[PDB]
Amino acid sequence: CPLMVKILDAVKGTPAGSVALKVSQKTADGGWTQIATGVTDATGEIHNLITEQQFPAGVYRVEFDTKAYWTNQGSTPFHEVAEVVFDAHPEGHRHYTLALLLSPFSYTTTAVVS
Template structure:
């Protein structure tokens, strides 16, 4: 129950962040087509220093690494991709959850968490992926908004 409540709070925070004014910290998200936000469900706090890698599926069904990054102290990754790099297609984001939990002094079940999604199927969009982590489970959601002009 507590995890479900934390996830609802995370999701509602994401919706509020989408309408953030330009002068707010992290407001560069408005111009970045893919953003990531991670919450540690055990601490009820952002999950900082989680490594992630973004792949795009090629015509031959193989995965090409596009970019990588780490979450900051606020559990966020900004400016992962430019509009030019975020072309229509199928993407996979792999989160190194095992290393995160090891750094927290905890054993975990999953080696990694993965999110696979199709981008821009209905025109240009802005995507925010949210990940709620615990050592033996993870939950994801996405906020998909209109692309900026």
């Protein structure tokens, strides 16, 4: 599990369950190719999102459907989506955890790189 997510709901103080996300890798011509999708469980995580094989060095984009999450909770949110874009160097069993803290009009994207 070289790419992990942890999404928290800052209003409820619980992980954000059922958040749809997708992972894209930057291609040679500068475009994006989608390599995985998933939805967070009740713990705000997604296990086995991608494998080491799918996660070579490069630039990646994780897009979180935060709007749907808030719309479903009954809140009108600001952001259409939450985008996390970063260069990955996973060569060496390097784990990446994308922590995301959500409020209707704010989010925090932090990274923990082990």
